[PDB]
């Protein structure tokens, strides 16, 4: 991602030093500069999937509006869990569900 200035508490930007032929991170709110350990500068991928479970909470068990299933939990072998579809509202989001057990307080898929 990106780092903050150590004393400016400001935004760091990449730049090059040609006397050493290297990439560093510098702040022009200050004069400090630090060694960048990654030549990566920018990322962009057109296919995205993250955002499936989204903001699950340990208090989701006491939600009364969620339907309650009878699926067998993987590791604790309980027969009581809730289920809900993906929280991402992208147009091509899959309808596969996530099951959260009310005993061990964790989520699992339907695979």
């Amino acid at each position: 991602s990106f780092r903050f200035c150590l004393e400016c508490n400001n935004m760091l930007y990449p730049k090059e030093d040609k006397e050493n032929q290297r990439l560093l991170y510098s702040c022009r709110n200050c004069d400090y500069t630090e060694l960048a350990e990654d030549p990566k500068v920018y990322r962009h991928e057109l296919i995205t999937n993250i955002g499936e479970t989204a903001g699950i909470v340990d208090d989701i068990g006491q939600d009364p509006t969620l339907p309650r299933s009878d699926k067998e939990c993987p590791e604790c072998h309980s027969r009581d869990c809730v289920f809900f579809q993906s929280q991402q509202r992208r147009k091509d989001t899959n309808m596969t569900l996530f099951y959260v057990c009310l005993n061990c307080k964790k989520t699992f898929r339907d695979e």
Binding site: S1, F2, F4, C8, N9, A54, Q87, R89, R90
Partner: protein, 205 residues
Amino acid sequence: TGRTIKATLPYVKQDIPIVIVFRALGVVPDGEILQHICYDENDWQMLEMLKPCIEEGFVIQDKEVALDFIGRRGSAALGIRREKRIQYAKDILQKELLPHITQEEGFETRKTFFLGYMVNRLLLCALERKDQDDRDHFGKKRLDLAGPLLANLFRILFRKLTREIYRYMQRCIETDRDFNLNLAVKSTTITSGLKYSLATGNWGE
């Protein structure tokens, strides 16, 4: 190109970038601003979503220059210059800018937190992580009955009566005679206004 976020405030002629008003409220460093907006450093997508706003809001550095910048566009006259344009901008930030959260000094932290919450909510809606708000939702709507309407009308009529009695006192002091305060006030104002508004249905003077 840049996906900038701007704020429309009362008594200005055009929008203002969010970083500018954040500096104006009194938070200079970028790290504190990001901590106010973002709540999880792993959410790099939301972090880079507002990165154009961070880079465009650089010519403004401290609180004073931000106040000058916001007062420059604060409509009004020209030639006020910094020494009182900053005061006018501070007044605009204090009152008429989120009046419901607070109206007194020492509570600007609450205003900054609420502004950060609003920006975060907007970013979550834009990042497709939450549905846009339904304006048809009856739970986010209110019904004004006779109470609030009569209260507003009475407030208007009472401020009118207060101004009239102030003028009458100012005029009577010049003559310097013992006013009885019974012939001083004109009760016909409030009665006539309420009667007219209820009779014709046109709410207002």
